Amino acid sequence: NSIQIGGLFPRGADQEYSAFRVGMVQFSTSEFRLTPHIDNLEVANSFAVTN
Amino acid sequence: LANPAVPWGQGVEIERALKQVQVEGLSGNIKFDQNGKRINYTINIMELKTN
Numbered sequence: 001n002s003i004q005i006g007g008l009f010p011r012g013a014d015q016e017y018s019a020f021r022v023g024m025v026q027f028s029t030s031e032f033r034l035t036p037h038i039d040n041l042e043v044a045n046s047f048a049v050t051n
Numbered sequence: 052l053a054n055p056a057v058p059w060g061q062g063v064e065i066e067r068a069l070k071q072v073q074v075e076g077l078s079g080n081i082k083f084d085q086n087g088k089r090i091n092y093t094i095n096i097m098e099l100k101t102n
């Protein structure tokens with residue numbers, strides 16, 4: 001039950017990704033498991049976001 | 052979208068070419084600064100009257 005979900009963290013966002021992993025650990029379940037792919041980028045950059 | 056994006060060299064030259072232009076046109080004197088905004092223009096101030 002692998003669920004692929006993309007994610008976007010602005011470079012310099014740390015505590016957000018931390019709380020993100022903590023959320024992943026606490027809300028993890030035997031039924032299904034979320035499989036995030038993280039890519040850090042410039043959030044203000046439209047090109048980077050599109051890519 | 053191919054990552055990492057690679058720009059062509061010629062582009063910078065074409066940009067400079069476009070920005071360095073000074074011509075006469077329907078908008079009056081046409082010239083640009085480094086950022087590409089209009090410089091040395093004339094905006095006619097008009098009033099609607101009876102005639």
Ligand SMILES: *[C@@H]1O[C@H](CO)[C@@H](O)[C@H](O)[C@H]1NC(C)=O
Binds near residue numbers: 090091
């Ligand atoms: C042309 O535009 C530039 C930018 O605003 C200004 O510095 C300069 O004085 C202008 N030249 C004339 C002759 O109006």
